[PDB]
């Protein structure tokens, strides 16, 4: 089975071509922490710790073109599928993990064995290592699940509230001309307030979820970075 | 001065980017694509009827049956298949003629 | 139900169907055509890359002896849990 379809970005692609045929500075970034990993001077890393910048920027651009514009009615999030997001996060996370593993430095994993020598190795430390190895994959799964569920719930709520607002506005506006106009006015004001609040909340939450999505990957990378000191 | 992004053409820069900048990511992506096309590229007729149509399966014309009919007609005509062969029918040609005369 | 239906791609244009047997056979024909010429010795890494993994997978499939039944991959109906056929 082969389905031919298109993304909902063609107009946005046209705008990108129109407005970026000439150079422009970028000073505001959703996830700025991918550029500044080291905060104490004289610390440097031999690992390609800045490899994630391009992917981070592209992912931010793609997800922002989709999610932020989805607040517009009838706009479609073409990628909104659980297993597709799983594939994306699998790609990124497993690629970085295999980059760390292909280094063939087993000592890098010494920190997995949690605790000190005082703790019993078999009954405490080994179980903790098992839990942490499991927790890495759980972090990947949680990242993708969170990204999916946030959008799904937000848009479900928006659709339901918009349906209710349409119903009351269309089939109960005549109350303005009736003696119970005050009740309708109060309800309409509440609906407007809820509309504004929901839109603001969704706008903020989309950006915040993208920030968290990139921060999980950056945390994965940072967990295995070692910094040398200049002398 | 020479820079990959400014001097090379788009295909060359693509190959360089995914071979010497993000090769592991490309490998993982190809692996995942192969998995998806090996295990997630099939849809049964019942599944199509349940979820495969925007407003619902139009049973009043059964387009799936027409599609399969065209498929099988094309296969038979092009491959010169004798659908009256005993293996297809489970009975000899003479028995088929007897049945036709009976019914 | 209706709110759930709003989360579908809105620009579906065409759907094409093809049997696994048919396109697998066509791919095998193409692979044989490109790996047949004499100037590609069987010991070349390219030829082994082309053939060995497929041979290994097919051998593993043939050797399989499972006590359970695996329903046909391409049935007409796979949505009934109580009817593997």
């Amino acid at each position: 089975m082969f389905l031919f379809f298109f993304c909902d970005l063609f107009w946005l692609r046209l705008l990108l071509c129109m407005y970026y045929c000439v150079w422009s500075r970028l000073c505001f970034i959703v996830y700025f922490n991918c550029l500044m990993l080291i905060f104490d001077f004289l610390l440097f890393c031999l690992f390609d710790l800045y490899l994630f910048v391009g992917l981070c920027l592209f992912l931010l651009l793609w997800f922002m073109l989709f999610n932020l514009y989805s607040l517009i009615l009838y706009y479609c999030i073409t990628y909104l599928n659980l297993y597709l997001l799983f594939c994306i996060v699998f790609l990124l996370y497993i690629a970085f993990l295999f980059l760390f593993c292909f280094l063939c430095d087993f000592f890098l994993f010494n920190n997995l064995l949690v605790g000190d020598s005082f703790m019993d190795v078999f009954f405490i430390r080994f179980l903790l290592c098992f839990l942490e190895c499991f927790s890495l994959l759980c972090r990947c799964l949680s990242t993708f699940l969170r990204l999916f569920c946030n959008l799904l719930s937000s848009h479900f709520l928006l659709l339901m509230f918009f349906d209710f607002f349409y119903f009351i506005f269309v089939f109960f506006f005549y109350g303005v001309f009736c003696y119970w106009f005050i009740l309708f006015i109060f309800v309409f004001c509440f609906c407007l307030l809820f509309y504004v609040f929901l839109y603001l909340l969704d706008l903020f939450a989309a950006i915040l979820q993208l920030f968290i999505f990139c921060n999980m990957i950056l945390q994965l990378i940072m967990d295995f970075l070692l910094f040398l000191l200049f002398v | 001065v020479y820079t990959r992004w400014k001097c090379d053409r788009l295909p060359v820069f693509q190959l360089k980017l995914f071979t010497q900048e993000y090769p592991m990511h490309a490998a993982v992506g190809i692996f995942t694509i192969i998995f998806l096309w090996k295990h997630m590229s099939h849809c049964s007729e019942e599944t199509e009827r349940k979820y495969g149509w925007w407003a619902g399966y139009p049973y009043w014309r059964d387009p799936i049956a027409r599609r399969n009919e065209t498929k099988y007609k094309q296969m038979i005509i092009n491959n010169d298949v004798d659908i009256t062969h005993p293996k297809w029918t489970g009975c000899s040609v003479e028995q088929l003629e007897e049945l036709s005369r009976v019914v | 139900s209706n709110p759930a239906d709003h989360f579908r791609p809105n620009l579906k244009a065409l759907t094409l169907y093809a049997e696994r047997q048919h396109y697998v056979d066509r791919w095998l024909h193409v692979k044989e055509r490109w790996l047949a010429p004499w100037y590609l010795p069987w010991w070349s890494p390219l030829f082994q890359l082309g053939t060995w993994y497929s041979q290994r997978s097919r051998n593993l499939f043939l050797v399989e002896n499972h006590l359970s039944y695996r329903p046909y991959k391409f049935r007409r109906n796979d949505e009934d849990r109580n009817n593997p056929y």
């Binding site: 597709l84 999916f148 | 490309a26 590229s41 | -």
Partner: peptide, 29 residues
């Protein structure tokens, strides 16, 4: 729900893979 579906997952994910392998270089350059 299609978001939880898999009957056309491969074709659906081709969009992301095309974006990653073909559109990202253009945006990059």
């Amino acid at each position: 729900l299609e978001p939880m579906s898999t009957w056309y997952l491969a074709s659906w994910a081709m969009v992301w893979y095309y974006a990653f392998f073909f559109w990202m270089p253009m945006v990059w350059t």
